[PDB]
Amino acid sequence: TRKAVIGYYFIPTNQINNYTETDTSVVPFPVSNITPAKAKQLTHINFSFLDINSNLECAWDPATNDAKARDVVNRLTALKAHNPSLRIMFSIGGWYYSNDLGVSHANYVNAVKTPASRAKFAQSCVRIMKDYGFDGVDIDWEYPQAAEVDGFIAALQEIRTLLNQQTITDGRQALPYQLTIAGAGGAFFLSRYYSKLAQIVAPLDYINLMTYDLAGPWEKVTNHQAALFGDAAGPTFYNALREANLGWSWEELTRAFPSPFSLTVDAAVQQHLMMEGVPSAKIVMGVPFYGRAFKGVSGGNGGQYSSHSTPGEDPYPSTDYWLVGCEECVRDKDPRIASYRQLEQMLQGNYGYQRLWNDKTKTPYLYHAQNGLFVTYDDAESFKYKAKYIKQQQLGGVMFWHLGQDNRNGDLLAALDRYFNAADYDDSQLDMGTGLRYTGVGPGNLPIMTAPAYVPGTTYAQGALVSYQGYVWQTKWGYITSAPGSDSAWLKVGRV
Amino acid sequence: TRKAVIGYYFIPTNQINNYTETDTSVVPFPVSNITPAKAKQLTHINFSFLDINSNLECAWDPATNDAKARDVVNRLTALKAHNPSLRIMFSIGGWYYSNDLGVSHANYVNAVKTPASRAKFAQSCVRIMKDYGFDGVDIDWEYPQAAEVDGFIAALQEIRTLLNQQTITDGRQALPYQLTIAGAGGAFFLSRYYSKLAQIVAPLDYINLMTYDLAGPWEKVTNHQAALFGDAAGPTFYNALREANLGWSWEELTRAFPSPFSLTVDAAVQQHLMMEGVPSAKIVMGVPFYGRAFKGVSGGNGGQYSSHSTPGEDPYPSTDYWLVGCEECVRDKDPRIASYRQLEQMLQGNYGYQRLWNDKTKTPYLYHAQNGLFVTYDDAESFKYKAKYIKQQQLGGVMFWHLGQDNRNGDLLAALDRYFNAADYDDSQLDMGTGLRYTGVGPGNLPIMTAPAYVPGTTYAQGALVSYQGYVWQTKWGYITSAPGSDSAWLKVGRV
Ligand SMILES: COc1ccc2cc3[n+](cc2c1OC)CCc1cc2c(cc1-3)OCO2
Ligand SMILES: COc1ccc2cc3[n+](cc2c1OC)CCc1cc2c(cc1-3)OCO2
């Protein structure tokens, strides 16, 4: 089965309203830059972003010129001429619209609140899909809180029901309409809904993990934003999942959620696989096509794990564009983010950057020793290890933000496609290194074990193992006369 | 309010059937030893034990001569002529009948299963009470398991309903019929039903905690069986309450249930009071009128906290009675337990026993250096500290197992009554020592706290405190945009 390759196409309202394929000052990345070769390397394009309005319906931003929007979307769906498996999804939400303090947050909360509201919202999603010609629905609410999760789930179930009906009505068995979400890739936000992951992922084709932005100027210590594995020399974090609303025991929580821990891509993936009912095949690893830049860093680690002086707030609360060589940063008025395209040009421009490699995290970084700058980013090399991980862990594929940030040759997308599909690419000896793996164990990833069947009537000592109702259990203390499941003395430690 | 003084009167069936007040070889402790003075020192006698039979009704051991039982019970209820507050309860259960592997356990489990069975059982209880002249019902099931708790609770509620009706029907408003249970005094057994303590204690006048047998030959290290407070030099135990099905977060469990911990009387009491809806006035502290003995102990600490050679199985798997001086050990054919009466006699008989005192646990012990014997017990000195604790913690009173183990003058019973009621006893300056206190915090003992009201739309840093919906909450990490209770990010730390 082919791995998914899901690329975001983000276009702001003002670029739609002034869309041209002839002026990168106005539209830096028009649809024309998605060549047939690139269209064939994608399985999905997530057009972004739509929103939920005051009427609790899916909708375009009210300032959108609808004729221009339709034309942009038609250009994207025309790419299917080059790739009969390609789907143009649309994404609802994103940080700006749907974060707790964002402009439309209340509409997300209220849309999912009732049977009537969920039905109206779900219908509106399918209507948008059909009217503009999209191939599925992606929801990027960042992020539902605990009390909202059940309504969120029910809304997803309702969309699934309509989409399946629409597939049959439209003859689309060969390319069914799909439903995805963008999920948190770090434990703090994930702990909002982690306990209900199984019910969240049941109606979905994929959950696309945002396994990036794991570092940024809002943290006091510079770090890799998408480390695959952990580096003991780097910062560690409170494991927020041990506070999730799971109902588990102290021993269960402790063995599943070591704390502090390394905030890495492997952590997020393994934390999802620890839950029963979450299939590896639905998990999609997100990767960034951009880096995050920091100023005021010190030496001794190439800029890693240093204090810094980078403002954390949004929008960038300054006019000082200190990322030397970053013309896109001046255009966009933020030196703290740079596309891979721009970073490549900064590297070939002799601006004083060194490209370094951390072989524990398996990620590159830039250090500017003259000016004290650090940039965490991904490239075709880090993507080798991530793609091997996706294959070994039997994940559904890869997602990235976003297409406009690749270089003009499409090298990052071409790399991902190569690592999954090229017949002359062989990563059998790629060394995944000795960086820290996430070691938590939970009900969904218990080791297979054997043990004598439990016998009613028997008194068991501390540490005894038995099999019962399909699991292997271990006593936590002595003189146990109760059966596994029926008494808190037993810990589930294996699968039969 | 007068403190309860609840003494168990245990008599085996063979002693009931051959009852006599003229031959200690046959009945060691006849009721006639309960003089009018001793009668005024008690508030309750728990006659022990009745059972639940295969008809799922309260009943006497079927081997009981009924007339002889009636006569013993009359000897007890005649004592009420000397104390108009005295109640002669009867206790159903005990370890032998009701432990998981005991002879009647299935009858306890099945009696409480359905509305019909609970009604039949409860009416059984009230009928026995009235037929024999008892003043209330005590249930000593050691111990209901989690799936049985709800049924057990309903049975208690049913008994409560009937007893109240009987109160009004017999005009007993001045001395209403009562309902009590014996509860676990150590965390391992307590963990079976701890999460439902509120429901359990609601229908009761008292829950009588079995805060003894906290050490024994089944343990690998010698220790005090009823330490009031902890000794850091002593052994510590896994806190099983952290595995009870409470539904609390990792931080909540950890702050409520330190582990390892000192298995003490104070621990059991404070563990009960950490649960909301468990009033201190219903909690009764149990104390033992017997000691437990260990052989093969090393020197250097008076035999405390040493290895040993004592068998742990029941019945005693030997005829070697190695406890120099203990008559009763041969009579009853177990050298591991000895009444306070017998231990006093061993102390005055110049057998080589030294009485030592632990001023952290506030308890006595006996050491026998030449044959290496260790005895843990209580006496009138340890009872001073336990009685002051009962007063300071506003507990309901004291319970003890059992009357027939006090010395012939009843010094232990007299001591308890004195410490609670004697005008010429003054414990105002009694020093409770520096032993370890149990410091866990839970929903039932959250402190009053004060903090600024939560402000929606505000972002909070790690450690911030707000007031919201009746509690004070603290954030566990930073950049918190969610409301308290609404999120894994916030920890209940106090009450408004
Ligand atoms: C640590 O928590 C934070 C704090 C701040 C965060 C800010 C942003 N994101 C996650 C954040 C986050 O998630 C982990 C997602 C990507 C993004 C794009 C943006 C933007 C802000 C953000 O401004 C406009 O474009
Ligand atoms: C270590 O686990 C055990 C193992 C064995 C145990 C045996 C007994 N108890 C706890 C035990 C225990 O609890 C900790 C409670 C008191 C008791 C009275 C008895 C009796 C046995 C027991 O026989 C009749 O009279």
Numbering used by the authors:
A (entry chain A), B (entry chain B): 3 to 498
How did the manuscript describe this experimental structure?
Glycoside hydrolase family 18 (GH18) chitinases (EC 3.2.1.14) catalyse the degradation of chitin, a homopolymer of β-(1,4)-linked N-acetylglucosamine, which play important roles in various life processes. For instance, the well-studied bacterium Serratia marcescens produces several GH18 chitinases to efficiently degrade chitin for nutrition. Because of the extensive roles of GH18 chitinases, inhibitors targeting these enzymes have potential applications as therapeutic agents and agrochemicals. In this study, we used SmChiB, a model GH18 chitinase from the bacterium S. marcescens, to improve inhibitory activity of berberine.
In this study, we found berberine was also a competitive inhibitor against SmChiB, a well-studied GH18 chitinase, with a Ki value of 11.79 μΜ. The crystal structure of the SmChiB-berberine complex was obtained by soaking and was resolved to a resolution of 1.94 Å. The crystal complex structure clearly revealed the location of berberine in the active pocket of SmChiB. Berberine occupied the active pocket across the sugar-binding subsites +1 and +2 which was characterised by the aromatic Trp97 and Trp220, respectively. The conjugate tetracycle plane of berberine was sandwiched by Trp97 and Trp220 to form π-π stacking interactions within distance of 4.2 and 4.3 Å respectively. This observation was consistent with our previous work that berberine inhibited GH18 chitinases mainly via π-π stacking interactions between the tetracycle plane and the aromatic residues in the binding pockets. Moreover, an unoccupied hydrophobic cavity formed by residues Phe190, Phe191, Leu216, Phe239, and Leu265 was identified. This space provides a favourable opportunity for the optimisation of berberine at its 9-O-position or 10-O-position. The binding modes of 4a-4c against SmChiB were nearly identical to that of berberine. As a result, the berberine analogues were able to form additional interactions such as hydrogen bonds and stacking interactions with surrounding residues of SmChiB, which may account for their increased inhibitory activities.
